[PDB]
Amino acid sequence: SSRPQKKGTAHHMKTRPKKTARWDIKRGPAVYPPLPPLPAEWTIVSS
Amino acid sequence: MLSPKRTRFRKQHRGRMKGISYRGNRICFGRYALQALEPAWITSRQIEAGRRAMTRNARRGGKIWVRIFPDKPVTVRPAETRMGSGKGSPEYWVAVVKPGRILYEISGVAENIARRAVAIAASKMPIRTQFIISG
């Protein structure tokens, strides 16, 4: 034969998982309405 | 064996075959022609063998032209020998052909027969050629 074959990191070049589909590349995080202001957490008033 | 006649220098580099062949796209002499698609290093043995086989199917008349002439040399080092210690002597001469280049032209036969002929001439060569009519 004369097809030298893919080995070492050259395998890892070829058969790495990757998206390569315009719609799947976009997307990102999901948007929301942020939130009304919340109270403290642990107010004291004692001793 | 279309060998060059006493060129400047003996041995020379490989370079590479980027780009489409722009200039040798046009047809001058023939009305039908064989044109290349993939780039390759075409030896003079491949040219001559294409020319013979194409000529055999001309038969009654119609003239054939070649439009590629090797020029570039290639050296294979002395067979079964370690790396280094200079270059080797040039074995054979090659035509750097790029995509979209004329290889053979032909005129003066029926389109029946020319197409038949260039099939054989395609079969002798190392690349995916194609038939082109224009002139």
Binding site: - | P78, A79, E80, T81, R82, G84, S85, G86
Partner: protein, 108 residues
């Protein structure tokens, strides 16, 4: 199988002599500063400018270097001093070097 390797008759050179344009066009120079080490007269000598034994082109006076067009397909090199060179404390460099200096002084 183990054949002999043929020796070469090549493999000599001289390490690049470092010629070319030392002081570029529209740039500062001195009295005596070498502008060009050229092997022949690629560029030619203009006004305010010496030309040496090696076709080395050096400035005689202060001022900025100029690569003029000689006439029929050649190049000259002349040198011109510059009249007034204004500096404004408005600008960013001036602002920042004074800020830096003031920080230096403030610390110590």
């Amino acid at each position: 199988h183990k054949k002999g390797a043929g020796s070469t008759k090549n493999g000599r050179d001289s390490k690049g002599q470092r010629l070319g344009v030392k002081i570029y066009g529209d740039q500062v120079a001195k009295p005596g500063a070498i502008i060009i080490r050229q092997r022949g007269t690629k560029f030619h000598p203009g006004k305010n400018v010496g030309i040496g034994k090696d076709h080395t082109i050096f400035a005689l006076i202060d001022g900025l270097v100029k690569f003029e067009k000689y006439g029929p397909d050649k190049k000259k090199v002349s040198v011109y001093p510059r009249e007034i060179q204004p500096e404004n404390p408005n600008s960013y460099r001036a602002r920042k070097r004074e800020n830096f200096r003031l920080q230096r002084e403030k610390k110590k």
